[PDB]
Design a protein around this motif. Sequence first.
Motif, PDB file in Angstrom:
ATOM      1  N   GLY A  50      -9.489  11.284 -13.014  1.00 11.05           N
ATOM      2  CA  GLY A  50      -9.002   9.918 -12.756  1.00 11.05           C
ATOM      3  C   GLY A  50      -7.919   9.565 -13.672  1.00 11.05           C
ATOM      4  N   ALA A  51      -7.021   8.862 -13.336  1.00  5.76           N
ATOM      5  CA  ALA A  51      -5.862   8.521 -14.092  1.00  5.76           C
ATOM      6  C   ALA A  51      -6.356   7.714 -15.403  1.00  5.76           C
ATOM      7  CB  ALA A  51      -4.972   7.557 -13.172  1.00  5.76           C
ATOM      8  N   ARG A  52      -7.406   7.082 -15.391  1.00  2.82           N
ATOM      9  CA  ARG A  52      -7.778   6.100 -16.584  1.00  2.82           C
ATOM     10  C   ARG A  52      -8.279   6.996 -17.568  1.00  2.82           C
ATOM     11  NH1 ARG A  52     -11.143   2.107 -13.651  1.00  2.82           N
ATOM     12  NH2 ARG A  52      -9.905   2.884 -11.936  1.00  2.82           N
ATOM     13  N   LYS A  55      -5.284   8.520 -19.269  1.00  4.13           N
ATOM     14  CA  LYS A  55      -4.793   7.580 -20.204  1.00  4.13           C
ATOM     15  C   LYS A  55      -5.376   7.571 -21.477  1.00  4.13           C
ATOM     16  CE  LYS A  55      -4.583   4.260 -17.025  1.00  4.13           C
ATOM     17  NZ  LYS A  55      -3.945   3.033 -16.533  1.00  4.13           N
ATOM     18  N   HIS A  76      -2.232  -2.140 -15.606  1.00  2.00           N
ATOM     19  CA  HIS A  76      -3.498  -2.051 -15.062  1.00  2.00           C
ATOM     20  C   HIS A  76      -4.789  -2.327 -16.096  1.00  2.00           C
ATOM     21  CE1 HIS A  76      -6.605  -0.467 -12.261  1.00  2.00           C
ATOM     22  NE2 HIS A  76      -6.185  -0.883 -11.540  1.00  2.00           N
ATOM     23  N   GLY A 131       0.589  -2.513 -10.395  1.00  2.00           N
ATOM     24  CA  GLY A 131      -0.371  -2.732  -9.242  1.00  2.00           C
ATOM     25  C   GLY A 131      -0.616  -4.125  -8.658  1.00  2.00           C
ATOM     26  N   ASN A 156       2.351   5.099 -16.617  1.00  2.00           N
ATOM     27  CA  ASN A 156       1.384   5.310 -15.591  1.00  2.00           C
ATOM     28  C   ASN A 156       2.044   5.265 -14.279  1.00  2.00           C
ATOM     29  OD1 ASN A 156      -1.291   2.662 -15.095  1.00  2.00           O
ATOM     30  ND2 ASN A 156      -0.867   4.710 -14.194  1.00  2.00           N
ATOM     31  N   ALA A 158       0.411   5.660 -11.225  1.00  2.00           N
ATOM     32  CA  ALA A 158      -0.794   6.129 -10.269  1.00  2.00           C
ATOM     33  C   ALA A 158      -0.274   5.537  -8.812  1.00  2.00           C
ATOM     34  CB  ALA A 158      -1.946   4.989 -10.804  1.00  2.00           C
ATOM     35  N   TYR A 159       0.757   4.640  -8.781  1.00  2.00           N
ATOM     36  CA  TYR A 159       1.368   4.359  -7.552  1.00  2.00           C
ATOM     37  C   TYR A 159       2.762   5.144  -7.312  1.00  2.00           C
ATOM     38  CZ  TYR A 159      -2.274   0.902  -6.122  1.00  2.00           C
ATOM     39  OH  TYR A 159      -3.315   0.191  -5.827  1.00  2.00           O
ATOM     40  N   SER A 179      -2.649   9.384  -9.908  1.00  2.00           N
ATOM     41  CA  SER A 179      -3.910   9.134  -9.291  1.00  2.00           C
ATOM     42  C   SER A 179      -4.198  10.117  -8.066  1.00  2.00           C
ATOM     43  CB  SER A 179      -4.399   7.822  -9.079  1.00  2.00           C
ATOM     44  OG  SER A 179      -5.640   7.479  -8.645  1.00  2.00           O
ATOM     45  N   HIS A 181      -6.595   9.776  -5.905  1.00  2.00           N
ATOM     46  CA  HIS A 181      -7.163   9.073  -4.740  1.00  2.00           C
ATOM     47  C   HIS A 181      -6.317   7.796  -4.477  1.00  2.00           C
ATOM     48  CE1 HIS A 181      -8.938   8.498  -8.827  1.00  2.00           C
ATOM     49  NE2 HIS A 181      -9.148   7.096  -8.547  1.00  2.00           N
ATOM     50  N   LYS A 182      -5.345   7.401  -5.374  1.00  2.00           N
ATOM     51  CA  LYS A 182      -4.616   6.371  -4.577  1.00  2.00           C
ATOM     52  C   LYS A 182      -3.351   6.989  -4.073  1.00  2.00           C
ATOM     53  CE  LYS A 182      -5.771   3.507  -7.429  1.00  2.00           C
ATOM     54  NZ  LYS A 182      -5.812   2.367  -8.436  1.00  2.00           N
ATOM     55  N   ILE A 190     -10.403  11.783  -9.497  1.00  2.00           N
ATOM     56  CA  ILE A 190      -9.291  12.780  -9.805  1.00  2.00           C
ATOM     57  C   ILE A 190      -8.007  12.377 -10.196  1.00  2.00           C
ATOM     58  CG2 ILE A 190      -8.433  13.392  -7.758  1.00  2.00           C
ATOM     59  CD1 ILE A 190      -8.697  16.388  -8.795  1.00  2.00           C
TER      60      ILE A 190
END
Lengths: 344, 344
Positions: A50-52, A55, A76, A131, A156, A158-159, A179, A181-182, A190
């Motif tokens: 995961g992205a978190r 980080k 986020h 986000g 970051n 993720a998007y 990310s 999944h997003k 993941i």
Amino acid sequence: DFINIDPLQTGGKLTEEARQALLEWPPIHDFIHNQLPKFLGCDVARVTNGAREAKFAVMHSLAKKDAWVVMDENCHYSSYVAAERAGLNIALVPKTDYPDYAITPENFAQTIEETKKRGEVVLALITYPDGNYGNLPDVKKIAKVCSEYDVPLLVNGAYAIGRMPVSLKEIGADFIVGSGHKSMAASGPIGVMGMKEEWAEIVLRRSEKYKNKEVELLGCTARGATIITLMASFPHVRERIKRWDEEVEKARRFAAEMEKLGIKQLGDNPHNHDLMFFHAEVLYEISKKAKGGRFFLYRELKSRKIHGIKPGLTRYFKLSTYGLSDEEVDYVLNAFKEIIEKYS
Amino acid sequence: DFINIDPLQTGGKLTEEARQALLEWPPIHDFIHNQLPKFLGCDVARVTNGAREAKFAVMHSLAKKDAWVVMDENCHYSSYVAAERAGLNIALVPKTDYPDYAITPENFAQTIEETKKRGEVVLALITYPDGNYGNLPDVKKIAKVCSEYDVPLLVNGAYAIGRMPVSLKEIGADFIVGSGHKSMAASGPIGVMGMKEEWAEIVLRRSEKYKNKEVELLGCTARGATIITLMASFPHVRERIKRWDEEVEKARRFAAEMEKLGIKQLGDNPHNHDLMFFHAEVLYEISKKAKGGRFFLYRELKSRKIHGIKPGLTRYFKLSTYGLSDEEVDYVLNAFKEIIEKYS
Ligand SMILES: *Cc1c(COP(=O)(O)O)cnc(C)c1O
Ligand SMILES: *Cc1c(COP(=O)(O)O)cnc(C)c1O
């Protein structure tokens, strides 16, 4: 079947290759040592849970007793908790006022300075885009403001990663996070992480006893349906970003329609991402008299085969037009036209 | 079809419902707040991204500068790397010599006492069972040793939860960890962690800003195919543990035949788990004259529809007879008899 407009899910629909592959269940070395570093435009890339986690892995690798991290105010909640877990002090660079809500390479650079006065600042991070509004701050710029303050910068994305083209080197930052999944059509948790070859000796330090394992990833080679789906979808994701300009034009069009209908898009104007934050007063007042009040909007859309907005929101809410066909874009714009009309 | 005898996978076969569930794709709250704690015999329970994440989470929550953790020599490398990542000093309680390779309450106590001499021991850990030999130390007794020494005990039950009945309350330890992908018929990286209520406010402490998110878990609710498969397979997993005794009788039966063939099972005797580690001097010698060399065993096995032993291993290797029918057991035994006759 529903028309989904959840920002969290539009970039995460599973691929056919990934759907079918998730069943059956690999050049994983190839994928992380070659394909991924390229795709992210960086030296070393690793897959995380995961992205978190990506980080936290770098924050924790750079943290020091009472050090500080400066991250944008639009960050986020995971960027913040990850910072709390790494034990860092947190400084938030303020955002431009309504309706821009932006993170300027100036407010950022000031906040860095006004905080380099509170103790050592070992890391800085910008969410790109954020986000809440889908605003894309000026990273190329902010990466300089940091490069010339000697603070490492984590991006970051993720998007961003898997949606629009990005290059850590083109940006000039130390770390980039994505990310699966997003924005990469993969499942389960993941993430992807890319850094300059100079940090692999820190963030990716090895174990003293298991010299083959990486301390920060708990020696995880992280296999499962997660990495499989990420990989299965990767070819399509690579191609997919070549359509980013269309996606943004499609979002711009959509906001313009909402504009006419009374609900206003905030943040970047013209917007530059599929994720949009809307101020719909005409809907908030209709909730005061509506059949279910706050939950009328939901019920209404649920009925019209439309899912994606947090039930109970009406005055403000976010959504994504990401993989919508033009007919689906029109159908939603129209659902709003109807609903508004219907109620008075 | 291929008969699977790999230890990492025999207890991780995806359930019928899990496969199908993974298709379509929930009472997650009921699961973690009521079902899971009941299944583990503990106060509080959480879902994590793998047993190692759960282990790192508590090591990180209990760590102090220069403090120590004592874990058994048979511990998993992830247990060790987790401790490195938390910045703790590691003291290993030694195992008994060949053939036993056991972790005893006595050596554990000695190790604790000697370590308490070098600094604060903030945590102890026994793996139950170890992933090399499949030996089950006497946790009940190791837990008592820990109580009287005042050091919290984390039980690493990656190979127990979802296989045999385990109860944190019965053991008398402070924390317990399990692995969904290796012992609970679930996919992707996912773990389970249970602890005594009193440890909840330390390890499950909330964020200062986002009072609703837990720091150690990076506020991750953890949705995805991962938790889906875990919940989908749970009814079957809850019932499958009621067959543990068959499983061990089956494993002992297997080991006994193997010995008749010259390949000897090490560790606990009689063995009390499906994971068995063997010494096969006869296979190692055949590899000095055999067709493919060290890969001859892989070859013969792969050729007979059998997967599970790392290729290039002939002298010592581990395997699991976990969910195999008595006929599949007999088949694999016969395959060994034949491979031996074929080469001498
Ligand atoms: C979801 C999200 C993350 C974290 O994503 P994961 O892979 O679930 O850890 C980080 N930043 C933003 C802006 C996000 O929306
Ligand atoms: C695999 C394993 C773990 C960790 O498993 P994950 O769920 O991938 O973190 C821990 N202990 C032992 C003995 C293991 O074999």
